[PDB]
Amino acid sequence: MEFGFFDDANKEYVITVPRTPYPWINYLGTENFFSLISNTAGGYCFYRDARLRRITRYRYNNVPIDMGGRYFYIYDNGDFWSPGWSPVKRELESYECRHGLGYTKIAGKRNGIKAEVTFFVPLNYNGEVQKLILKNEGQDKKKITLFSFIEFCLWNAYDDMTNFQRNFSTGEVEIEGSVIYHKTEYRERRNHYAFYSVNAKISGFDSDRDSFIGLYNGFDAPQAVVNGKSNNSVADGWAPIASHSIEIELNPGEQKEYVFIIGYVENKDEEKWESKGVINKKKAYEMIEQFNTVEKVDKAFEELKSYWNALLSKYFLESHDEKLNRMVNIWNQYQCMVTFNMSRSASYFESGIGRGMGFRDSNQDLLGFVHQIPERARERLLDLAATQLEDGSAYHQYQPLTKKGNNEIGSNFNDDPLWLILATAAYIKETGDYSILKEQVPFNNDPSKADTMFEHLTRSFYHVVNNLGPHGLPLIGRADWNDCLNLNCFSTVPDESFQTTTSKDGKVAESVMIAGMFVFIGKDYVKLCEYMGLEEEARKAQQHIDAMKEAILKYGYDGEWFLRAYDDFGRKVGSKENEEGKIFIESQGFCVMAEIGLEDGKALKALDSVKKYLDTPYGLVLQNPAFTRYYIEYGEISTYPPGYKENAGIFCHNNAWIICAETVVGRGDMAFDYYRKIAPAYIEDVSDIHKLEPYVYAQMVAGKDAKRHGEAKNSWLTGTAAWNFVAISQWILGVKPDYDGLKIDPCIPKAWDGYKVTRYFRGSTYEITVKNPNHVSKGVAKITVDGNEISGNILPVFNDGKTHKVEVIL
Amino acid sequence: MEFGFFDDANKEYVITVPRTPYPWINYLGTENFFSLISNTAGGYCFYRDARLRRITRYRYNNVPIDMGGRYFYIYDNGDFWSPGWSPVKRELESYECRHGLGYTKIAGKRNGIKAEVTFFVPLNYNGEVQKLILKNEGQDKKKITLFSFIEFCLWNAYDDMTNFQRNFSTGEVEIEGSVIYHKTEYRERRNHYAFYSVNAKISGFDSDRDSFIGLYNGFDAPQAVVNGKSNNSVADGWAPIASHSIEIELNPGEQKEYVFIIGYVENKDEEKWESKGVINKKKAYEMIEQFNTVEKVDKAFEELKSYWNALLSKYFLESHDEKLNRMVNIWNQYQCMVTFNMSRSASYFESGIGRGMGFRDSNQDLLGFVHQIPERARERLLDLAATQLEDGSAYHQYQPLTKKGNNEIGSNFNDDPLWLILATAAYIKETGDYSILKEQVPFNNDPSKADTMFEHLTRSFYHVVNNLGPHGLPLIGRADWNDCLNLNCFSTVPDESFQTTTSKDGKVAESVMIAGMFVFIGKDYVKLCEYMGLEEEARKAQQHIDAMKEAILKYGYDGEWFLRAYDDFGRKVGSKENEEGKIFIESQGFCVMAEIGLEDGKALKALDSVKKYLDTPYGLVLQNPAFTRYYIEYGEISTYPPGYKENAGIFCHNNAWIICAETVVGRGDMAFDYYRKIAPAYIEDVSDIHKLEPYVYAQMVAGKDAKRHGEAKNSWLTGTAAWNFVAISQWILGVKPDYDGLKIDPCIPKAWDGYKVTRYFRGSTYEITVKNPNHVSKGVAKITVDGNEISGNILPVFNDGKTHKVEVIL
């Protein structure tokens, strides 16, 4: 059962019922101002920081859900309702919500009056614009009153909602004209404020929450809207709010328009005051005047439209499948771009209190958006290497705001250094420039102890080989890519972090997942050492890789699949001799990607075991069987109930590595079937079971061992979007960036007649048509570029800004 | 305008309208289980920790206010309502709330059905009992359905409400019989769980919040109560809840009884499971069986009643004023006892996230409850000196749970060491037990470096002389008792605390408030130096006091009042040369209390200036004029808007010191007028202005410079109760504990004919009758004990467990 449809022409998802299984949210903002908005006009806004610069108050896990947001009330002869059906919740004649790229439209009609509101954050603007349209579709003279309402936050999310002993007496507002200014602690060290305005004369206002709403009233029926008049109150502490009231007369067939802005202003400390106690409002006036006409809002709406069109034009697919076309062309790349602007800060599952994102997440996500923003990808890479320590280690948590690591969390996540080389190779493969390896990069953000970026990759390479385990496998630190597999923590008391608490020496437990990472990533390190003319180091580096490859074969294979790791007691983890967690999914993804058991049939055996044991109708579980008790030797993984999160949950992040692994063995039928199980467009018809947004990926889907099998959690902010795009765009469709040019190597289902992919690569557009006369999955027989046959499967690099017709026959 | 009345016979405040100006709350629990409850049955409960062991979820600053609590629903042929009028909010025929000592009663009637619920935490019990009474007062056969509802917390307040990415998949419940067990994270590391039970067979239940309430429904109209039956859901992640449903048939004139328990159970790690995945419930069964009959609940209610009666029987007053009698005998001593059990952890203004209370707060509050719990006051004193450092300093924040200081907060609050001697003298004067000074007390919680408790008092005494300013006044350090006067901070960054951020050397700024403290407290130190036979130490200590006293005269006097402090630039603070803050309230309170300027008329001049400048109809403001801008040199004091908190707000904590100072000069008319302005019983008639509980003190009342002058904030948890009790019981009524016995020295209004005070002191009861034939304020002409005249004004110590009639003539 579905609650809407995809509007591919408008690149929107249209929601037709307000009572959605969960609030489905969108994201507005590109550079500094960001805001969350749901289909009922919930959410909040902030400036660059959901923790230290939150503008609008929002309550997570509220009863009712999603109470608090940009609420509009329409009062008509004792009857009031809201266009988004919330918070009034009075039945409407018609309703519609449209989530677009960087905007949201909500329309509502009741008793002959229709209201449509458009929300979007304009480019290079520190504010959210709300264009409202009111129309009289009846047959009589009508007089109505429109109420606007937002709730302010006291600029510090943690303080606004833990420290009432102080902040209940600090709330301050200013009311001037149609604008309500929030200036809490502006008489103090703060130099920033926020405002809410309308481009029309108001008949009333309110700045005190108690006056407009009432102490014992909710958002559904504010006492001022119920009575139809505003109280004209001024806030003195407690909870400041902003609210406008307008009297409107609507003749039949006549419509009226209004513009609302939630702006943010920063001031220099020497020009903070226009007068004693009066806030300097010189830039708030300019912000309001910039969008005081609808034609101004219309022009900015088209400017944002072209911005998102350009961000998706580097990879265009024309195939027979309508669900596949919309994922690759619109929604997969839209979530990848959003996740770079949003990191892991604010969502409907992330409260915005955290301090940063993981070090690997910035590197892993870089693969997804490297083709969209090549220039801003190189800046992120250098800022990540600056965080790196001198010995080859990196801080676990990266803080993009301060551009530095987190000393409190620390280090000793041995998988983290390898992600830097993999991300660096992806940047170089996409762009083709090698100047990155010669730039001077500080160590631990210390300019004095700086060296080349290639040296940073060298230490990351030798951090693995300088910390080998008893079997020669890389030593696991606090954990690996799987943050809940802590093999030297052994925590016995609550309120203690599994990740940062280490009780064992850590000189015994090793991981096989990093070993498969080391061979797969180190293969790209030997190519770099060849480019720098360092033949001896390249020869020695390959020797370490070959030793690891034989160590993987000797101490990494269980007989049918690959081992997961070794714990502190020298026991095999992820083996058939165990009682639970007999087979994992991380070692199969990367070891097959490293092409370790191709010739011996070992890779095929592992993938047949993945299908036999880990396959579900909604995805692939992390491991089987699920842990039914708590294992102190493994860490946080066994803490979850079975089927949830890491306890045999469906992590769509590592499902892509299985998708890529099926390409290596040459099974396009299996690879695309795995992709379809977790793609949002293919599960939109089961939206009542998925329960989350049917247009973006979610971090985790409940596995076969849960009672809610198929239900998603933690959507809109994950590395799933980046890896699943790489799996389909590069490993399945065969358009692989590579050194010296674009590589073609598809692995598609046999029944496919063909497809066409338009690719932007190093300044040129490759229009690649893949034909499948004989229905085969893998294997290229001929490639034609511009009507001339070529040798091999690497397209020449032109860099001339034109289109080249590439004809591929399997 | 009033919202209720005082029931002095039952020691209750009766609330007659559910819509009070604010939710008026009570406290339950004495030892480990503590609960917050308002007049609408809101609030939450926890075990020893509102931060790490919270049991019930509660949302601060909610819309509507106080949503979430022990909610009961009565369903009657499609109509439902709640006894506390919340959250349903349907008009009732009758309503009543009664806040008692350790219990709360709520009654409600609608459509002929009356519901009464009694809430209290029994003694030595880890649970809250809710005895519900249902009665049919109509004239017909009726069939109704009763719904109960609580919402569970995930045991970690900060994690339950910031970390949804993990805890949304960890919620676990267990439904067995009529009990719903909450067992989130019980499988991994927690050995504790909570249960909600009823003592009757149920017809339905619910454990998932969405099933019972609905995603888009609030507490007012849950979808299960609206439909009239339970969904029998089992929670799996998301938000666990507990709910029972009972079908009840009530003939006319018939009533039914029900008992509900919210228990907390801890288990040993060995005995944690009855079976694989099944929680060991043997302790929960015993807890439920202990209160499974109404007579059992009745007996426990009387046991708690006698507990609070004995706690208030040490000081009994019989006077002509009914408002004065209820404050001294019931409500002042009740808040003092609660504030020791509650510290500063949980209130409707304290979110329960902090880690402890101030070091001085534990010492300052000790004066209030030393007569009530002499044995548990000595234990607290020794634990306070245990955290003291070796040089004579103490950590600013004390943590009663861990019985140690806070290293993160730090030290260098130079007023803190003096509070230890003042509290020690108060304990010694009350009890007469001098053995405290000989016990071995570790330094910095290190048993190796331990010495006598008297040595601890020596270092705290000598921490003042070893740190003197240019004028010989004590160095202020980071701050003094006034936590917002930071003369070394100079902060310009919004996100750093004024208290712990120090940018100056701190070798110049001095404080006159500590100087008045040093002379007043040091007077008690010379007496202690005489008890141990250290005559030379007493001589040297008195010399330092005399030198400090002459420094106060030479540098601490402004001409009409006393200076407040000196900042880092060597400028007078709290002087008529200043543009704002010309006079403070803390230098006048303690310097006059130190008998400084008595013979010269200097003390009288300061008190006349306090009345002239700082007096308001609702109390005395901190300083005048208020700071209308930000002063970097002073710290957090100027950050507040004028009239709020430290910016010329009415702090009733330091109003008591002015009350005590008026006794020294001999003006009982002024002292009692000051007391009446802030006493809860005398301001109950303006409850619409006070806006807070009219039966307990509040930390701060808005001053004359505010727009809400007279409105209180941060009630129920402050040191105001302790000091205001000392001011009236000891300095006004004249019953002062002394080293050699009980001292009589009243300073009462002249128009008073007399009064009687019954006092328990060192094992004997003194029934003191004070009569005023010649209407004078101060001065004792005769004292008769047991019919025989005595010399002086110190009553002999009998310690025989008898009653002695003390006749006092002024």
Please give the resolution of this entry in Å, rounded to 1 decimal: 2.6
In this structure, are A299 and A391 located in the same domain? no
Q: Which residues of B touch A629 (CB under 8 A)?
A: 187, 276
Number of domains in chain B: 2
From B404's Cα to the closest Cα of chain A, the distance in A is: 19
Pairing of strands A278-279, A712-715: unpaired
Q: Which of A61, A155, A707 sits opposite B236 (nearest CB)?
A: A707
Indicate if A261 and A146 belong to the same structural domain: yes
CA distance B142 to B155: 41
Please say whether the beta carbons of A105 and A114 come within 8 A: no
> Any chain B CB within 8 A of the CB of A17?
no
Disruptive mutation site among B67, B92, B156, B165 for chain A (greatest number of A CBs within 10 Å): B165
Does any CB of chain B come closer than 8 Å to the CB of residue A52?
yes
Is residue A158 a contact partner of residue A223, using CB atoms and an 8 Å limit?
Answer: no
CATH value at residue A569: 1.50.10.10
Residue (of A437, A285, A420, A436) closest to A364 by Cα position: A420
Question: Closest Cα to residue A461, out of A421, A432, A428?
Answer: A421
| B252 in reach of chain A (CB within 8 A) | no
Put simply, the answer to whether A495 touches B629 (Cβ < 8 Å) is no
Residue B122: asked if its preceding bond is cis (omega within 30°), the reply is no
Instruction: Identify which of A19, A59, A218 has the shortest CB distance to residue B64.
Output: A218
Q: How far is A338 from chain B (nearest CA, A)?
A: 19
Q: What are the structure tokens assigned to A479, written together?
A: 């954990």
Partner B contacted by A495 (CB < 8 A): yes
CB contact under 8 A, A64 and B168: no
Q: Are residues A193 and A330 both part of a single domain? A: no
Q: Is residue B405 part of a domain?
A: no
The span from the CA of A262 to the CA of A265, in Å, is 10
B301 within some domain: yes
Is B362 part of any domain? no
- Strands B572-573 and B619-620 come out as unpaired
Residue B142, in any domain of the structure: yes
Rounded to an integer, what distance in angstroms lies between the CA atom of residue B725 and that of residue B746? Answer: 14
Q: Is A197 on the interface with B (CB under 8 A)?
A: no
Chain CA centroid to CA A38, Å: 16
**A253, A212: one domain:** yes
Closest to A189 (Cβ–Cβ): which among B492, B645, B708?
B492
Please, what's the largest Cα pairwise distance for chain A?
88
Query: Could you tell me which chain A residue has the CA closest to the CA of B238?
Result: A61
Residues A370 and A450 in one domain: yes
Q: Which helix (H) or strand (E) holds A808?
A: strand A803-809
Q: Which amino acid is at B182?
A: H
Measured from the Cβ of residue B754, the count of other Cβ atoms closer than 10 Å reads 16
Q: Chain B: residue nearest A633 by CA?
A: B188
**Does residue B269 sit in helix, strand or coil?**
coil
Min distance B556 CA to chain A CA atoms (Å): 30
Rounded Cα distance between B47 and B126, Å, is 8
| Minimum Cα–Cα distance from B192: chain A residue | A494
Whether omega before A122 lies within 30 degrees of 0, making that bond cis, reads no
Q: Is B483 tagged catalytic?
A: yes
Residue with tokens 């803390």: B586
Report the residue count for chain A.
810
B219 CB within 8 Å of a chain A CB = yes
**Cα–Cα distance list, B764 to A49, B70, B402, B426 (Å):** 64, 44, 36, 18
Please, which residues have CB within 8 angstroms of residue B131's CB and are 6 or more apart in sequence? B117, B118, B257, B258, B259, B260, B294, B297
Does the distance separating the beta carbons of A187 and B162 come in below 8 Å? Answer: no
Residues 6+ apart with CB under 8 A from B177: none
Residues 6+ apart with CB under 8 A from B15: B3, B4, B24, B39, B96, B97, B98, B99
Q: Residues with Cβ < 8 Å from A509, sequence gap 6 or more?
A: A469, A475, A476, A487, A488, A565, A566, A567, A568
Q: What approach was used to elucidate this structure?
A: cryo-EM
A91 and A134 share a domain?
yes
Which of A703, A732, A761 delimits the end of a domain?
A732
Provide the shortest C-alpha distance from residue B436 to chain A (in Å).
36
Q: Is residue B624 one of the residues assigned to a domain? A: no
The catalytically annotated residue of A208, A483, A705, A738 is: A483
**Nearest CB to A217: which of B64, B628, B645?**
B64
Question: Are A329 and A295 in the same domain?
Answer: no
User: Do A627 and A700 reside in the same domain of the chain?
Assistant: yes
The Cα diameter of chain B in Å comes to 88
| Closest by Cα among B478, B484, B468 to B504 | B478
Nearest CA in chain B to A59: B62
Cα(A202)–Cα(A550) distance, integer angstroms: 77
A39 Cα to chain B: minimum distance (Å): 13
Q: Which domain holds residue A42?
A: 4-309
- For residue B784, the one-letter residue type is T
Residue B297 domain-assigned (yes or no): yes
Catalytic residue among B361, B416, B483, B524: B483
CB A116, CB A261: distance < 8 Å: no
The number of C-beta contacts closer than 8 angstroms across A and B is 170
Interchain CB distance below 8 Å, A639 and B63: no
Dihedral (C-alpha) A414, A418, A420, A426: value to the nearest 10 degrees? -150
**One domain, residues A725 and A739:** no
| Residue B287 maps to a domain | yes
Last-in-domain residue among A708, A732, A756: A732
Q: Which amino acid, residue B694?
A: P
Q: Which of B65, B188, B353 sits opposite A162 (nearest CB)?
A: B353
User: How far, in Å, CA of A86 to CA of A70, rounded?
Assistant: 10
What CATH code is carried by the domain that includes residue B115? 2.70.98.40
Q: Which residue, of A681, A701, A732, is where some domain finishes?
A: A732
Residue A604 sits in the same domain as residue A691: yes
Partner A, chain B 763-802, Cβ-Cβ below 8 Å? none
| Residues A428 and A509 placed together within one structural domain of the fold | yes
Helix (H, G, I), strand (E, B) or coil at B466: coil
CB distance A390 to A443 below 8 Å? yes
Q: Is B170 on the interface with A (CB under 8 A)?
A: yes
* CB–CB contact A166 B628 (8 Å): no
A218 and chain B: CB distance < 8 Å anywhere? yes
Q: How many CB atoms lie within 10 A of CB A376?
A: 13
- Cβ–Cβ below 8 Å for B708 and A237: yes
- Please give the Cα distance from A165 to B351 (Å, whole number): 9
Per-position b or e across A523-552, b if 16+ CB within 10 A of its CB: ebbbebbbeeeeeebbeebbebbeebbebb
Q: Is B58 contained in some domain?
A: yes
CB atoms within 10 A of CB A246: 20
Instruction: Assess B376–A contact: CB distance below 8 Å, yes or no.
Output: no
B768 CB burial (10 A radius; 0-12, 13-18, 19+): buried
Query: Which of A364, A417, A358 is closest to A722 using CA atoms?
Result: A364
**Element at B505 (helix H, strand E):** none
Comparing CA positions, the residue from B508, B507, B491, B511 lying closest to residue B499 is B491
CA distances from B746 to A572, B666, B669, B757 (A): 82, 9, 12, 11
CATH number at residue A786: 2.60.420.10
Residues of chain B contacting residue A635, judged by C-beta atoms under 8 Å apart: none
Phi and psi, residue B149, nearest 5°: -160, 125
Coil vs helix vs strand at A417: helix
**A721, A785: one domain:** no
Q: Which two tokens stand for residue B302?
A: 């009387």
